[PDB]
Design a protein around this ligand. Sequence first.
Ligand code: NI
Length: 341
Amino acid sequence: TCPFYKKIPGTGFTVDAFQYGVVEGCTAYFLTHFHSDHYAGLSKHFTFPVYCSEITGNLLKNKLHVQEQYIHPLPLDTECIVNGVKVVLLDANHCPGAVMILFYLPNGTVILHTGDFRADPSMERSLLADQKVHMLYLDTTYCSPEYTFPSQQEVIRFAINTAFEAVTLNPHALVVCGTYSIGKEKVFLAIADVLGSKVGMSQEKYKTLQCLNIPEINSLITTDMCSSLVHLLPMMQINFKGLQSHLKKCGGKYNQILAFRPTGWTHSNKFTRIADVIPQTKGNISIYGIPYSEHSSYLEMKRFVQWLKPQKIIPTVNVGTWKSRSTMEKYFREWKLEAGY
Ligand code: NI
């Protein structure tokens, strides 16, 4: 059945709740972003109102064929009324089109649902600064102190310098980047930019990127693989067998592959600096795992919450085990006692 942490009290609303059939008493279904664990269940047969960002509404219409009459896109940073309730959508710093949602309940309670987010100090100067938030529905993906990672900027600097060095030493090397969803476009776009190439990809993935309002996208991407020396492949193909196979397909245009797997966290982070990352190599193929995260680190999460000072926290991730739930609640209490709220 629909879990309680997907329901907004005092409303007929649900958030990221499309796989439970008709939720009893739901008058409006919000979708925070276009990732499959969140949209699971949506299709051309859905007939209730879906509220989302413009970019997520492009993806619903073009990729899932949801009929236009049930898509309700909202502008960001704008007070809007939905079924008699004031809401605002805020940038979540996750994938393209991802939002946080502020609900202003008729009784005076204010609720923030973060969706999936990467907390940032820039959020401390949005519409969030203007009033008190009483309840926080929090993306707790990496809510444990072992989760450290570098800034997105540091990671992109490493990837640009590594690619440019490799291809300038060997003009016959191919760069490959893995993907299995929207998000992390900066990885492949920044590398293609330093190399003076477009990124080549399948027709399905090009379609997906054409929904994202990225400026000058027609100048950066293409479906002509032959004209491109940065290729995008499914994340499943980023292994020695998959890459050997792909190289055969390029017809002796290339004699080396340098591949990137933008993972979330991996335990080489508790020890290793970004400066010190090395690839796995077999023959003329090298694979780099880079810690490009679109979720908060533990410290980023902790700073956001100690700034916001919510009265109650409801985790949305890692809620399926008692040991995880109990561990999170201990951190929440620590943060509250340290900060004084
Ligand atoms: Ni997500």
